[PDB]
CSV table of C-alpha atoms in Angstrom, one decimal:
chain,number,residue,atom,x,y,z
Q,1,UNK,CA,13.0,46.5,-99.0
Q,2,UNK,CA,13.0,43.0,-100.5
Q,3,UNK,CA,10.8,40.4,-98.8
Q,4,UNK,CA,11.9,36.8,-98.5
Q,5,UNK,CA,9.7,33.8,-98.0
Q,6,UNK,CA,10.7,31.5,-95.1
Q,7,UNK,CA,12.1,29.0,-97.6
Q,8,UNK,CA,14.3,31.7,-99.1
Q,9,UNK,CA,15.4,33.0,-95.7
Q,10,UNK,CA,16.7,29.5,-94.8
Q,11,UNK,CA,18.5,29.2,-98.1
Q,12,UNK,CA,20.4,32.5,-97.5
Q,13,UNK,CA,20.9,31.6,-93.8
Q,14,UNK,CA,22.5,28.3,-95.0
Q,15,UNK,CA,24.9,30.2,-97.2
Q,16,UNK,CA,25.7,32.6,-94.4
Q,17,UNK,CA,26.5,29.6,-92.1
Q,18,UNK,CA,28.8,28.2,-94.8
Q,19,UNK,CA,26.6,25.2,-95.2
Q,20,UNK,CA,26.0,26.1,-98.8
Q,21,UNK,CA,27.9,27.7,-101.7
Q,22,UNK,CA,25.2,29.5,-103.8
Q,23,UNK,CA,21.8,31.2,-103.4
Q,24,UNK,CA,19.3,32.0,-106.1
Q,25,UNK,CA,18.0,34.8,-103.9
Q,26,UNK,CA,21.4,36.6,-103.7
Q,27,UNK,CA,22.0,36.0,-107.4
Q,28,UNK,CA,18.6,37.5,-108.3
Q,29,UNK,CA,19.2,40.5,-106.1
Q,30,UNK,CA,22.5,40.8,-108.0
Q,31,UNK,CA,24.6,40.4,-104.8
Q,32,UNK,CA,27.7,38.3,-104.3
Q,33,UNK,CA,27.0,34.6,-103.4
Q,34,UNK,CA,29.2,34.7,-100.3
Q,35,UNK,CA,28.7,33.8,-96.7
Q,36,UNK,CA,29.5,37.4,-96.0
Q,37,UNK,CA,26.9,38.8,-98.5
Q,38,UNK,CA,24.2,36.5,-97.1
Q,39,UNK,CA,25.1,37.7,-93.6
Q,40,UNK,CA,24.8,41.3,-94.6
Q,41,UNK,CA,21.5,40.8,-96.3
Q,42,UNK,CA,20.1,38.9,-93.3
Q,43,UNK,CA,21.2,41.7,-91.1
Q,44,UNK,CA,19.8,44.3,-93.6
Q,45,UNK,CA,16.4,42.5,-93.8
Q,46,UNK,CA,16.3,42.1,-90.1
Q,47,UNK,CA,16.1,38.3,-90.3
Q,48,UNK,CA,19.3,38.3,-88.1
Q,49,UNK,CA,20.3,40.9,-85.5
Q,50,UNK,CA,23.9,41.9,-84.9
Q,51,UNK,CA,24.3,39.6,-81.9
Q,52,UNK,CA,24.4,36.5,-84.0
Q,53,UNK,CA,27.9,35.0,-84.9
Q,54,UNK,CA,28.3,32.3,-87.6
Q,55,UNK,CA,32.0,31.7,-87.1
Q,56,UNK,CA,31.8,28.6,-84.9
Q,57,UNK,CA,29.3,27.3,-87.5
Q,58,UNK,CA,31.5,28.0,-90.5
Q,59,UNK,CA,34.5,26.5,-88.7
Q,60,UNK,CA,32.3,23.6,-87.8
Q,61,UNK,CA,33.0,23.9,-84.1
Q,62,UNK,CA,30.4,22.2,-81.9
Q,63,UNK,CA,27.8,24.6,-80.4
Q,64,UNK,CA,25.9,21.9,-78.4
Q,65,UNK,CA,26.7,20.9,-74.9
Q,66,UNK,CA,28.1,17.4,-74.7
Q,67,UNK,CA,25.2,15.1,-73.8
Q,68,UNK,CA,26.9,12.0,-72.5
Q,69,UNK,CA,26.3,10.4,-69.1
Q,70,UNK,CA,29.0,11.2,-66.7
Q,71,UNK,CA,30.0,8.6,-64.0
Q,72,UNK,CA,30.4,9.4,-60.3
Q,73,UNK,CA,33.8,9.4,-58.5
Q,74,UNK,CA,34.6,6.0,-57.0
Q,75,UNK,CA,33.9,6.5,-53.2
Q,76,UNK,CA,36.1,3.5,-52.3
Q,77,UNK,CA,39.1,5.0,-54.0
Q,78,UNK,CA,42.0,5.9,-51.6
Q,79,UNK,CA,42.9,9.6,-51.5
Q,80,UNK,CA,44.9,11.7,-49.0
Q,81,UNK,CA,42.7,14.0,-47.0
Q,82,UNK,CA,43.8,17.6,-47.1
Q,83,UNK,CA,40.5,19.0,-46.1
Q,84,UNK,CA,42.0,20.6,-43.0
Q,85,UNK,CA,44.3,22.8,-45.1
Q,86,UNK,CA,43.2,26.3,-46.2
Q,87,UNK,CA,42.8,26.0,-50.0
Q,88,UNK,CA,41.9,28.6,-52.6
Q,89,UNK,CA,40.6,28.4,-56.2
Q,90,UNK,CA,41.5,31.8,-57.5
Q,91,UNK,CA,40.1,33.0,-60.8
Q,92,UNK,CA,38.7,35.8,-62.9
Q,93,UNK,CA,35.3,37.3,-62.2
Q,94,UNK,CA,32.4,35.5,-63.8
Q,95,UNK,CA,34.0,32.2,-64.7
Q,96,UNK,CA,32.2,29.2,-63.3
Q,97,UNK,CA,34.5,26.3,-64.2
Q,98,UNK,CA,37.0,26.1,-61.4
Q,99,UNK,CA,39.8,23.9,-62.5
Q,100,UNK,CA,42.3,24.4,-59.7
Q,101,UNK,CA,43.2,25.4,-56.2
Q,102,UNK,CA,46.4,26.4,-54.4
Q,103,UNK,CA,47.7,25.9,-50.9
Q,104,UNK,CA,50.9,25.8,-48.8
Q,105,UNK,CA,52.4,24.0,-45.9
Q,106,UNK,CA,55.4,25.1,-43.8
Q,107,UNK,CA,57.6,22.1,-43.5
Q,108,UNK,CA,60.4,23.7,-41.5
Q,109,UNK,CA,63.9,24.9,-42.1
Q,110,UNK,CA,62.4,27.3,-44.5
Q,111,UNK,CA,61.1,24.4,-46.7
Q,112,UNK,CA,57.7,25.1,-48.0
Q,113,UNK,CA,55.4,22.7,-49.7
Q,114,UNK,CA,53.3,24.2,-52.5
Q,115,UNK,CA,50.0,22.5,-53.2
Q,116,UNK,CA,48.3,22.8,-56.6
Q,117,UNK,CA,45.1,20.8,-56.8
Q,118,UNK,CA,43.3,20.3,-60.1
Q,119,UNK,CA,39.9,18.9,-61.0
Q,120,UNK,CA,40.2,15.1,-61.1
Q,121,UNK,CA,38.7,14.8,-64.6
Q,122,UNK,CA,40.7,11.6,-65.5
Q,123,UNK,CA,38.8,9.8,-62.7
Q,124,UNK,CA,35.6,10.3,-64.8
Q,125,UNK,CA,37.0,10.2,-68.3
Q,126,UNK,CA,39.1,7.1,-69.2
Q,127,UNK,CA,41.0,7.2,-72.5
Q,128,UNK,CA,38.9,5.8,-75.4
Q,129,UNK,CA,35.6,6.5,-73.7
Q,130,UNK,CA,32.6,8.3,-75.3
Q,131,UNK,CA,33.6,11.2,-73.1
Q,132,UNK,CA,37.2,11.1,-74.2
Q,133,UNK,CA,36.4,10.8,-77.9
Q,134,UNK,CA,34.0,13.7,-77.7
Q,135,UNK,CA,36.6,15.8,-75.9
Q,136,UNK,CA,39.1,14.9,-78.5
Q,137,UNK,CA,36.7,15.9,-81.2
Q,138,UNK,CA,36.4,19.4,-79.7
Q,139,UNK,CA,40.0,19.7,-78.6
Q,140,UNK,CA,38.9,22.4,-76.1
Q,141,UNK,CA,36.1,24.3,-74.4
Q,142,UNK,CA,34.7,27.1,-76.6
Q,143,UNK,CA,34.4,30.4,-74.7
Q,144,UNK,CA,32.2,32.7,-76.7
Q,145,UNK,CA,31.3,36.2,-75.4
Q,146,UNK,CA,27.6,35.2,-75.1
Q,147,UNK,CA,27.9,31.5,-73.9
Q,148,UNK,CA,30.3,28.6,-73.1
Q,149,UNK,CA,30.3,25.3,-74.9
Q,150,UNK,CA,32.3,23.0,-72.7
Q,151,UNK,CA,34.6,20.3,-74.0
Q,152,UNK,CA,32.8,18.0,-71.5
Q,153,UNK,CA,29.2,17.8,-70.1
Q,154,UNK,CA,27.9,20.5,-67.7
Q,155,UNK,CA,27.1,17.8,-65.1
Q,156,UNK,CA,30.8,16.7,-65.3
Q,157,UNK,CA,31.9,20.3,-64.6
Q,158,UNK,CA,29.3,20.4,-61.7
Q,159,UNK,CA,30.6,17.5,-59.7
Q,160,UNK,CA,34.3,17.8,-60.7
Q,161,UNK,CA,34.8,21.6,-60.3
Q,162,UNK,CA,36.9,22.6,-57.3
Q,163,UNK,CA,35.0,24.4,-54.6
Q,164,UNK,CA,31.5,23.8,-56.0
Q,165,UNK,CA,31.0,21.5,-53.0
Q,166,UNK,CA,32.0,21.7,-49.3
Q,167,UNK,CA,34.6,19.1,-50.3
Q,168,UNK,CA,35.9,17.8,-53.6
Q,169,UNK,CA,38.3,15.1,-54.9
Q,170,UNK,CA,41.3,16.2,-56.9
Q,171,UNK,CA,44.6,15.1,-58.5
Q,172,UNK,CA,47.3,17.2,-56.8
Q,173,UNK,CA,50.9,18.1,-57.4
Q,174,UNK,CA,53.0,19.2,-54.5
Q,175,UNK,CA,56.5,20.8,-54.6
Q,176,UNK,CA,58.8,21.2,-51.6
Q,177,UNK,CA,60.6,24.4,-52.4
Q,178,UNK,CA,63.5,26.0,-50.4
Q,179,UNK,CA,63.7,29.8,-49.9
Q,180,UNK,CA,65.9,29.9,-53.1
Q,181,UNK,CA,63.2,28.4,-55.3
Q,182,UNK,CA,64.8,25.0,-55.6
Q,183,UNK,CA,62.6,21.9,-55.4
Q,184,UNK,CA,63.7,19.0,-53.3
Q,185,UNK,CA,60.7,16.9,-54.0
Q,186,UNK,CA,57.8,16.8,-56.4
Q,187,UNK,CA,54.8,14.6,-55.7
Q,188,UNK,CA,51.6,13.7,-57.6
Q,189,UNK,CA,48.6,12.1,-55.9
Q,190,UNK,CA,44.8,11.7,-55.4
Q,191,UNK,CA,43.5,13.9,-52.7
Q,192,UNK,CA,40.4,15.4,-51.1
Q,193,UNK,CA,40.3,19.1,-50.4
Q,194,UNK,CA,37.8,21.8,-49.3
Q,195,UNK,CA,38.4,24.8,-51.5
Q,196,UNK,CA,37.2,28.4,-51.1
Q,197,UNK,CA,36.7,30.4,-54.2
Q,198,UNK,CA,37.9,34.0,-54.8
Q,199,UNK,CA,38.5,36.4,-57.6
Q,200,UNK,CA,42.0,37.6,-58.3
Q,201,UNK,CA,41.1,41.1,-57.0
Q,202,UNK,CA,39.8,39.5,-53.8
Q,203,UNK,CA,43.0,37.5,-53.3
Q,204,UNK,CA,45.0,40.7,-53.9
Q,205,UNK,CA,43.3,42.5,-51.1
Q,206,UNK,CA,44.2,39.7,-48.8
Q,207,UNK,CA,47.7,39.8,-50.0
Q,208,UNK,CA,47.9,43.5,-49.3
Q,209,UNK,CA,46.5,42.8,-45.8
Q,210,UNK,CA,49.4,40.3,-45.4
Q,211,UNK,CA,47.2,37.2,-45.0
Q,212,UNK,CA,48.4,33.6,-45.6
Q,213,UNK,CA,48.7,31.6,-47.7
Q,214,UNK,CA,48.6,34.6,-50.1
Q,215,UNK,CA,51.8,36.1,-48.8
Q,216,UNK,CA,53.7,32.8,-49.0
Q,217,UNK,CA,52.3,32.1,-52.4
Q,218,UNK,CA,53.5,35.4,-53.6
Q,219,UNK,CA,57.0,34.7,-52.2
Q,220,UNK,CA,57.3,31.3,-53.9
Q,221,UNK,CA,56.0,32.9,-57.1
Q,222,UNK,CA,58.6,35.7,-57.1
Q,223,UNK,CA,61.3,33.0,-56.5
Q,224,UNK,CA,60.1,30.7,-59.3
Q,225,UNK,CA,59.9,33.6,-61.8
Q,226,UNK,CA,63.4,34.8,-61.2
Q,227,UNK,CA,64.9,31.4,-61.8
Q,228,UNK,CA,63.1,31.1,-65.1
Q,229,UNK,CA,64.2,34.6,-66.0
Q,230,UNK,CA,67.8,33.5,-65.3
Q,231,UNK,CA,67.3,30.7,-67.8
Q,232,UNK,CA,66.1,33.0,-70.6
Q,233,UNK,CA,62.3,33.1,-70.1
Q,234,UNK,CA,60.8,36.3,-71.4
Q,235,UNK,CA,57.5,38.0,-70.8
Q,236,UNK,CA,54.7,38.5,-73.3
Q,237,UNK,CA,52.1,40.1,-71.1
Q,238,UNK,CA,50.1,42.5,-73.3
Q,239,UNK,CA,46.9,44.2,-72.3
Q,240,UNK,CA,43.9,41.8,-72.1
Q,241,UNK,CA,40.2,42.5,-72.0
Q,242,UNK,CA,37.0,40.6,-71.4
Q,243,UNK,CA,34.3,40.5,-74.0
Q,244,UNK,CA,30.8,39.6,-72.9
Q,245,UNK,CA,27.4,39.8,-74.6
Q,246,UNK,CA,23.7,39.5,-73.8
Q,247,UNK,CA,20.3,41.0,-74.6
Q,248,UNK,CA,21.6,44.4,-73.4
Q,249,UNK,CA,24.4,44.3,-76.0
Q,250,UNK,CA,28.1,43.8,-76.2
Q,251,UNK,CA,30.7,44.7,-73.5
Q,252,UNK,CA,34.4,45.0,-73.6
Q,253,UNK,CA,36.0,46.1,-70.3
Q,254,UNK,CA,39.8,45.7,-69.5
Q,255,UNK,CA,40.8,42.7,-67.4
Q,256,UNK,CA,42.5,43.5,-64.1
Q,257,UNK,CA,45.8,41.8,-63.5
Q,258,UNK,CA,46.8,42.1,-59.8
Q,259,UNK,CA,50.1,40.6,-58.5
Q,260,UNK,CA,48.0,37.7,-57.2
Q,261,UNK,CA,47.0,36.9,-60.8
Q,262,UNK,CA,50.6,36.5,-61.8
Q,263,UNK,CA,51.2,34.4,-58.7
Q,264,UNK,CA,48.5,31.8,-59.5
Q,265,UNK,CA,49.9,31.6,-63.0
Q,266,UNK,CA,53.4,31.0,-61.7
Q,267,UNK,CA,51.9,28.3,-59.4
Q,268,UNK,CA,50.3,26.7,-62.5
Q,269,UNK,CA,53.7,26.9,-64.2
Q,270,UNK,CA,55.1,25.1,-61.2
Q,271,UNK,CA,52.6,22.3,-61.2
Q,272,UNK,CA,53.3,21.8,-64.8
Q,273,UNK,CA,57.1,21.8,-64.5
Q,274,UNK,CA,56.7,19.6,-61.4
Q,275,UNK,CA,54.6,17.2,-63.4
Q,276,UNK,CA,57.0,17.1,-66.3
Q,277,UNK,CA,59.6,16.0,-63.7
Q,278,UNK,CA,57.4,13.3,-62.1
Q,279,UNK,CA,56.6,11.9,-65.5
Q,280,UNK,CA,60.3,11.9,-66.6
Q,281,UNK,CA,61.4,10.0,-63.4
Q,282,UNK,CA,58.7,7.4,-63.8
Q,283,UNK,CA,59.0,7.1,-67.6
Q,284,UNK,CA,55.4,8.2,-68.1
Q,285,UNK,CA,54.8,9.5,-71.7
Q,286,UNK,CA,53.1,12.9,-71.8
Q,287,UNK,CA,52.3,15.6,-74.3
Q,288,UNK,CA,55.4,17.5,-73.1
Q,289,UNK,CA,55.3,21.1,-74.2
Q,290,UNK,CA,58.5,22.1,-76.0
Q,291,UNK,CA,59.5,25.3,-77.7
Q,292,UNK,CA,62.8,26.4,-79.3
Q,293,UNK,CA,64.5,29.8,-79.2
Q,294,UNK,CA,62.7,32.7,-80.7
Q,295,UNK,CA,63.5,34.3,-84.1
Q,296,UNK,CA,65.7,36.9,-82.4
Q,297,UNK,CA,66.2,38.6,-79.0
Q,298,UNK,CA,64.1,41.7,-78.2
Q,299,UNK,CA,64.9,44.1,-75.4
Q,300,UNK,CA,62.5,46.0,-73.2
Q,301,UNK,CA,59.1,45.5,-71.7
Q,302,UNK,CA,57.3,48.3,-73.5
Q,303,UNK,CA,54.4,47.4,-75.7
Q,304,UNK,CA,56.3,47.7,-79.0
Q,305,UNK,CA,58.8,45.3,-77.3
Q,306,UNK,CA,56.4,42.6,-76.0
Q,307,UNK,CA,54.5,43.0,-79.2
Q,308,UNK,CA,57.6,42.1,-81.3
Q,309,UNK,CA,58.6,39.4,-78.7
Q,310,UNK,CA,55.3,37.7,-79.4
Q,311,UNK,CA,55.7,37.7,-83.2
Q,312,UNK,CA,59.2,36.3,-82.7
Q,313,UNK,CA,58.1,33.3,-80.6
Q,314,UNK,CA,59.2,29.9,-81.8
Q,315,UNK,CA,56.4,27.3,-82.2
Q,316,UNK,CA,55.2,25.0,-79.4
Q,317,UNK,CA,55.5,21.3,-80.2
Q,318,UNK,CA,53.9,18.6,-78.1
Q,319,UNK,CA,55.8,15.4,-77.8
Q,320,UNK,CA,55.9,12.1,-75.8
Q,321,UNK,CA,59.5,12.7,-74.6
Q,322,UNK,CA,60.6,15.8,-72.6
Q,323,UNK,CA,62.3,18.8,-74.1
Q,324,UNK,CA,63.3,22.3,-73.3
Q,325,UNK,CA,61.0,25.3,-73.5
Q,326,UNK,CA,62.9,28.5,-74.0
Q,327,UNK,CA,60.0,30.9,-74.0
Q,328,UNK,CA,59.6,29.8,-70.4
Q,329,UNK,CA,63.1,29.0,-69.2
Q,330,UNK,CA,62.4,25.4,-68.4
Q,331,UNK,CA,64.2,22.1,-69.4
Q,332,UNK,CA,60.9,20.2,-69.5
Q,333,UNK,CA,57.2,21.2,-68.9
Q,334,UNK,CA,53.6,20.0,-69.4
Q,335,UNK,CA,50.3,21.7,-69.0
Q,336,UNK,CA,48.4,19.8,-66.3
Q,337,UNK,CA,46.1,22.2,-64.6
Q,338,UNK,CA,43.2,22.6,-67.1
Q,339,UNK,CA,42.0,19.1,-67.9
Q,340,UNK,CA,38.4,20.4,-67.9
Q,341,UNK,CA,38.9,22.8,-70.7
Q,342,UNK,CA,42.0,21.8,-72.7
Q,343,UNK,CA,42.3,18.3,-74.2
Q,344,UNK,CA,46.0,18.0,-73.8
Q,345,UNK,CA,45.7,18.6,-70.0
Q,346,UNK,CA,43.1,15.9,-69.7
Q,347,UNK,CA,45.5,13.5,-71.4
Q,348,UNK,CA,48.2,14.3,-68.8
Q,349,UNK,CA,45.7,13.3,-66.1
Q,350,UNK,CA,44.8,10.1,-67.9
Q,351,UNK,CA,48.5,9.3,-68.1
Q,352,UNK,CA,49.3,10.3,-64.6
Q,353,UNK,CA,46.2,8.5,-63.3
Q,354,UNK,CA,47.1,5.3,-65.2
Q,355,UNK,CA,50.5,5.2,-63.7
Q,356,UNK,CA,49.2,6.3,-60.3
Q,357,UNK,CA,48.4,2.7,-59.4
Q,358,UNK,CA,47.2,0.7,-62.3
Q,359,UNK,CA,47.6,-0.3,-66.0
Q,360,UNK,CA,50.1,1.2,-68.4
Q,361,UNK,CA,49.6,4.7,-69.8
Q,362,UNK,CA,49.5,5.3,-73.5
Q,363,UNK,CA,52.6,4.7,-75.6
Q,364,UNK,CA,54.5,7.5,-77.4
Q,365,UNK,CA,52.8,6.2,-80.5
Q,366,UNK,CA,49.1,6.5,-79.7
Q,367,UNK,CA,50.2,9.6,-77.8
Q,368,UNK,CA,51.5,11.5,-80.8
Q,369,UNK,CA,48.3,10.4,-82.4
Q,370,UNK,CA,45.9,12.0,-79.9
Q,371,UNK,CA,48.0,15.1,-79.8
Q,372,UNK,CA,47.7,15.4,-83.6
Q,373,UNK,CA,44.0,14.6,-83.8
Q,374,UNK,CA,43.0,17.0,-81.0
Q,375,UNK,CA,45.2,20.0,-82.0
Q,376,UNK,CA,43.4,20.3,-85.3
Q,377,UNK,CA,40.1,20.5,-83.4
Q,378,UNK,CA,41.5,22.9,-80.9
Q,379,UNK,CA,42.8,25.2,-83.7
Q,380,UNK,CA,39.2,25.4,-85.1
Q,381,UNK,CA,37.7,26.0,-81.7
Q,382,UNK,CA,40.1,28.7,-80.8
Q,383,UNK,CA,39.8,30.5,-84.1
Q,384,UNK,CA,36.0,30.5,-83.5
Q,385,UNK,CA,36.7,32.2,-80.2
Q,386,UNK,CA,38.9,34.8,-81.8
Q,387,UNK,CA,36.5,35.5,-84.6
Q,388,UNK,CA,33.6,35.9,-82.2
Q,389,UNK,CA,35.4,38.1,-79.7
Q,390,UNK,CA,36.2,40.3,-82.7
Q,391,UNK,CA,32.6,40.4,-83.8
Q,392,UNK,CA,31.3,41.6,-80.5
Q,393,UNK,CA,34.3,43.9,-79.9
Q,394,UNK,CA,33.2,45.5,-83.2
Q,395,UNK,CA,29.7,45.9,-81.9
Q,396,UNK,CA,31.0,47.6,-78.8
Q,397,UNK,CA,33.0,50.0,-80.9
Q,398,UNK,CA,30.0,50.8,-83.0
Q,399,UNK,CA,27.9,51.7,-79.9
Q,400,UNK,CA,30.2,54.6,-79.3
Q,401,UNK,CA,30.6,56.4,-82.7
Q,402,UNK,CA,32.1,59.5,-81.1
Q,403,UNK,CA,34.2,58.0,-78.4
Q,404,UNK,CA,38.0,58.5,-78.6
Q,405,UNK,CA,40.4,55.7,-77.7
Q,406,UNK,CA,43.9,55.7,-76.4
Q,407,UNK,CA,46.4,53.7,-78.5
Q,408,UNK,CA,50.1,53.2,-79.0
Q,409,UNK,CA,52.0,52.5,-82.2
Q,410,UNK,CA,53.3,49.0,-81.5
Q,411,UNK,CA,54.7,48.1,-84.9
Q,412,UNK,CA,55.1,49.6,-88.4
Q,413,UNK,CA,55.6,48.8,-92.1
Q,414,UNK,CA,55.9,51.7,-94.5
Q,415,UNK,CA,53.7,54.7,-94.0
Q,416,UNK,CA,51.4,52.2,-92.3
Q,417,UNK,CA,51.7,52.0,-88.5
Q,418,UNK,CA,49.8,49.3,-86.6
Q,419,UNK,CA,48.7,50.7,-83.3
Q,420,UNK,CA,47.0,48.9,-80.4
Q,421,UNK,CA,44.0,50.1,-78.3
Q,422,UNK,CA,44.9,48.7,-74.8
Q,423,UNK,CA,41.4,49.1,-73.4
Q,424,UNK,CA,40.0,47.0,-76.3
Q,425,UNK,CA,43.1,44.7,-76.8
Q,426,UNK,CA,42.3,45.6,-80.4
Q,427,UNK,CA,44.7,46.8,-83.1
Q,428,UNK,CA,44.1,48.6,-86.4
Q,429,UNK,CA,46.2,49.6,-89.4
Q,430,UNK,CA,46.7,53.4,-89.7
Q,431,UNK,CA,49.1,55.5,-91.8
Q,432,UNK,CA,50.9,58.2,-89.9
Q,433,UNK,CA,54.4,59.1,-88.7
Q,434,UNK,CA,54.4,58.2,-85.0
Q,435,UNK,CA,57.2,56.0,-83.8
Q,436,UNK,CA,56.8,52.6,-82.2
Q,437,UNK,CA,55.7,53.7,-78.7
Q,438,UNK,CA,53.9,56.9,-79.6
Q,439,UNK,CA,50.5,57.3,-78.0
Q,440,UNK,CA,47.7,58.8,-80.1
Q,441,UNK,CA,43.9,59.0,-79.6
Q,442,UNK,CA,42.0,57.2,-82.4
Q,443,UNK,CA,38.5,57.4,-83.6
Q,444,UNK,CA,36.9,54.5,-85.5
Q,445,UNK,CA,35.5,54.9,-89.0
Q,446,UNK,CA,32.5,52.8,-90.0
Q,447,UNK,CA,32.0,49.3,-88.7
Q,448,UNK,CA,31.2,46.5,-91.2
Q,449,UNK,CA,30.2,43.3,-89.2
Q,450,UNK,CA,29.9,40.8,-92.1
Q,451,UNK,CA,33.4,41.7,-93.5
Q,452,UNK,CA,34.4,42.4,-89.9
Q,453,UNK,CA,36.7,45.3,-90.7
Q,454,UNK,CA,37.3,48.8,-89.4
Q,455,UNK,CA,39.4,51.8,-90.5
Q,456,UNK,CA,40.6,54.3,-88.0
Q,457,UNK,CA,41.4,58.1,-88.0
Q,458,UNK,CA,44.0,59.6,-85.7
Q,459,UNK,CA,41.9,62.1,-83.8
């Protein structure tokens, strides 16, 4: 009903974005002067549609693509050619920022060399560069359901991504593993590979048809997971979904997890462990990922079990010197396979690259510094992602008023049981009896986007 002038609209839009604290307009309309009330009013007046999300804005997370010039790879740099080896960058469907590729060589006597290649980002982003500083400012790439704001420029992703060109450079980690999962040698070096891209599902079909390197990969993965599971590593694999949005609306379909998906993960886990080792031997400081023992032990693999397991998790501390990680069942570990989307990973590559022929890496001092500076930014960026995935997931829910969803009481607290809707990877508070594991169909009551809340009835 009320009609705002452009000037007034911008004022309320500024309050909704959290760039302001008051609004004469809202006051006059006798509404709360809150980013949420402004958001609601804009929606109500049609100035904004339900597809807009102000969370990245409020959290002050960058929404502009980094516009810095990106240098080319040095063509004179010496790299080992592994372009003759079958290599696969296996991912989810839709993602277009290939960060890694796997491969395997039979060395004989049952010794198999695992190859994990990663985008050679450090070759284009030296520490302290405009690129570096900007990546530190963001802490990580922001994956919104309707767009992706990279931690680095798109052009960088373009020439650095694995398998975006018939051939591509890469920083690789290789592990010589015996049938029993023991590594006899870990190596880290600059290479050139020709990767072939595939979706997890596609790789799974090739695994079922018994093709290589898929089969071998699966074997080494089953071996590596069992060792870690002997050392106390536990699994927190809850249902996951994909949230996408466009002009047609918001979508939330479950994410397939074939065995092959778990395999590539274990391979990443391996490169990380393998890199923690290499770093330790050469005294190279890294943002080692450490984690203590959980609040308590929790038995089972049911949802209510993994759900609790996740809340019990001890914090993850990044430090210049190595340290155990119980959650994973590893003495030392580092994340080194996603330098194109996680800042800490990029640092690992700057460190490795520095040592790998050249000047000294960063000291534990400046190291702890960049870890601290980036994490803060990474926290904001990730919260922005969560808040937006929630926003669009709500839309999706709203576009199916009648629909009934399957849930399972995963946790409780008084007459209030918190159940999870697997297909939505969503969870809502609901009072009922049902015990931690009881399935019950739910029906959502009345979405409110601004407040971003929902109540549910046990249909």
